[PDB]
Design a protein around this ligand. Structure first.
Ligand SMILES: CC(C)[C@@H](NC(=O)[C@H](CS)NC(=O)CCC[C@H](N)C(=O)O)C(=O)O
Ligand SMILES: [Fe+2]
Length: 328
């Protein structure tokens, strides 16, 4: 098994005003997006050691009582309003992974999309402040930190495609973004439950099967344990881990609006029996956001693809991924 070429891109110019320097970052984003589809963003300015420490404290101290109280509908029939946001329980002896998902902190009972009961909008659920002091403050702060990084990355993607730098970012707004953070624990277990390991066609033992992401882009921080593979024409290649950088890739909405010029890379998660964290931020736009598809290969950029509202895309895509790869 060979190793993927995943470049490290200093994204710090994307926060500045040196336009030539932004263009040089954009070129590197374009090159990586047309190759394996992944790159590491470095010099990003986020305190990832505090991110990992506070996430670890939460996963290790939450009790079965609290997990039931936070559980999404798939694990708790009482919580009909929690499809996305809440706790995704492990099943001892059967399912190893457990996770906690939260959405835009601005989604409150007073928010108009919540009042309208619009699909894919939910109010976050949180543990008791006295049992997890400072956790909600940290998690909401983190949402806006990675929102900021993601805004800057979207400027790079726009310039890479020959668009003005706000082409995507204008649709990525704090008041309505459907972006989510998932705090995922992959545990060390001895014996490891065989029901939690899948075998791929090529014999590789997996924790999560091949998929494309449901996102515009995905902005991922992982601890320093190698696990991801990306599909190429010549087979799957290992993505090296780096627990100081953010791993970036496009989701299938980008592939749609660029007529597959920037593909959504197919990737999968190898089984590794090690305690590790996986903290993705899925960059989603607003429910009514529509970007006219274009084709950068054509002089006039003309595309025959239909515009797709981000809300409809997200609703269909989340259901599809559960049905293909299972309830997480
Ligand atoms: C990361 N995998 C994942 O995060 C997998 C595949 S990208 N993602 C999902 O299941 C989609 C979660 C979407 C989230 N609940 C939401 O409502 O926005 C891993 O390490 O397994
Ligand atoms: Fe993924």
């Amino acid at each position: 098994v060979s190793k993927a070429n995943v470049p490290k891109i200093d994204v710090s110019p994307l926060f500045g005003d040196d336009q030539a320097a932004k263009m040089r970052v954009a070129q590197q984003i374009d090159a990586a997006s047309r190759d394996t589809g992944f790159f590491y963003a470095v010099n990003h300015g986020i305190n990832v050691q505090r991110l990992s420490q506070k996430t670890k404290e939460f996963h290790m101290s939450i009790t079965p009582e609290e997990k039931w109280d936070l559980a999404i509908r798939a694990y708790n029939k009482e919580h009909q309003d929690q499809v996305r946001a809440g706790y995704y329980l492990s099943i001892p002896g059967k399912k190893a992974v457990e996770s906690f998902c939260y959405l835009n902190p601005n989604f409150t009972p007073d928010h108009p999309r919540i009042q309208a009961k619009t699909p894919t909008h939910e109010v976050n659920v949180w543990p008791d402040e006295t049992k997890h002091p400072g956790f909600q403050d940290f998690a909401e702060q983190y949402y806006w930190d990675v929102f900021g990084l993601s805004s800057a990355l979207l400027k790079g993607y726009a310039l890479a495609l020959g668009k003005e730098e706000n082409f995507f970012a204008r649709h990525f707004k704090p008041d309505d973004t459907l972006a989510s953070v998932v705090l995922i624990r992959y545990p060390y277990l001895d014996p490891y439950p065989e029901a939690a390991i899948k075998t791929a066609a090529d014999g590789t033992k997996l924790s999560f099967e091949w998929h494309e992401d449901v996102s515009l882009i995905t902005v991922l921080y992982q601890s320093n344990v190698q696990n991801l593979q990306v599909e190429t024409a010549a087979g799957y290649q290992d993505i090296e881990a780096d627990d100081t950088g953010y791993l970036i890739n496009c989701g299938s909405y980008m592939a749609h609006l660029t007529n597959n010029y920037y593909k959504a890379p197919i990737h999968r998660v190898k089984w590794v029996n090690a305690e590790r964290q996986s903290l993705p931020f899925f960059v989603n736009l607003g429910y009514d956001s529509v970007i006219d598809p274009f084709d950068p290969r054509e002089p006039n950029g003309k595309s025959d693809r239909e515009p797709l509202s981000y809300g409809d895309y997200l609703q269909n895509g989340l259901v599809s991924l559960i049905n293909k790869n299972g309830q997480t």
